[PDB]
Amino acid sequence: AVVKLQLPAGKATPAPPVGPALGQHGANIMEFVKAFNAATANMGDAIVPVEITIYADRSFTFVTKTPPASYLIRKAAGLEKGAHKPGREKVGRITWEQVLEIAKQKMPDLNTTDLEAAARMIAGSARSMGVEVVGAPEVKDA
């Protein structure tokens, strides 16, 4: 449906693809290049999702519920500036300390909330990137 973005880290850029293309999209853009600009302000770039909605007429909808899947990754986790040939070298290795509860922010909506869920969800473009990282030394069944 009605979906696109506005980014990258701070000092929002409505560039030729990122917000001047608001015509037959929502079109009240003088005061709402400013009510999103505190909803992606002072957070830091790694991905920062943008949720945008549909209407009968012209304005006023929600923003986002979580920035996962490469974000709580390349702040300090997994040292994952995960260099080209995406990496069978350990471009950076961790455990589930900067992955599992760095974001219980994940819990708004990925449909599974208890944390072997959206924790290991975001260990998808983090953990299985070549070096499937680790959640433990493999629980020791007994």
Partner: protein, 143 residues
């Protein structure tokens, strides 16, 4: 004839027949337009409060198992349910009614021990007979 493990741990796991006593049990399908109802894929980490599969597998032959008396709501057998939080909170947590949110959810069959019919209208429309039972403390005979 594998009778595939799709039937084996999904043939009830003999659960909800013995789980959240296996009766009061009632109406309403294996699925229609997927937008709305919800706590679909959200009942905290499971779908312990919904179901998964298989009208032909269980309901045709599963058996009589585990009960409470007779019947009859609106109609009879084609697709059914799973929960502990029945008639009162069966409907402050799910499946509002008439038509519904999405486009008008449809049909099923029940059996508890409260003697009678439909299960939609009088029993299942956020009926607060919990907050209208401090109405009975002086009713029907008192001076």
């Amino acid at each position: 004839m594998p009778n595939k493990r799709n039937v084996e741990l999904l043939a009830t796991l003999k659960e909800n027949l013995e789980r959240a006593q296996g009766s009061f049990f009632l109406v309403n399908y294996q699925g229609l337009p997927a937008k709305e109802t919800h706590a679909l894929r959200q009942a905290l980490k499971q779908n312990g409060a919904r179901l998964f599969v298989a009208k032909n597998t269980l309901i045709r032959l599963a058996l009589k198992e585990l009960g409470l008396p007779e019947l009859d709501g609106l109609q009879g057998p084609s697709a059914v349910y799973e929960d502990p939080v029945a008639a009162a909170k069966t409907l402050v947590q799910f499946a509002k009614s008439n038509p519904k949110g999405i486009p008008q959810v449809k049909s099923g069959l029940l059996q508890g021990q409260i003697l009678t019919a439909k299960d939609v209208e009088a029993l299942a429309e956020l009926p607060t007979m919990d907050e209208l039972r401090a109405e009975l403390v002086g009713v029907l005979q008192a001076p």
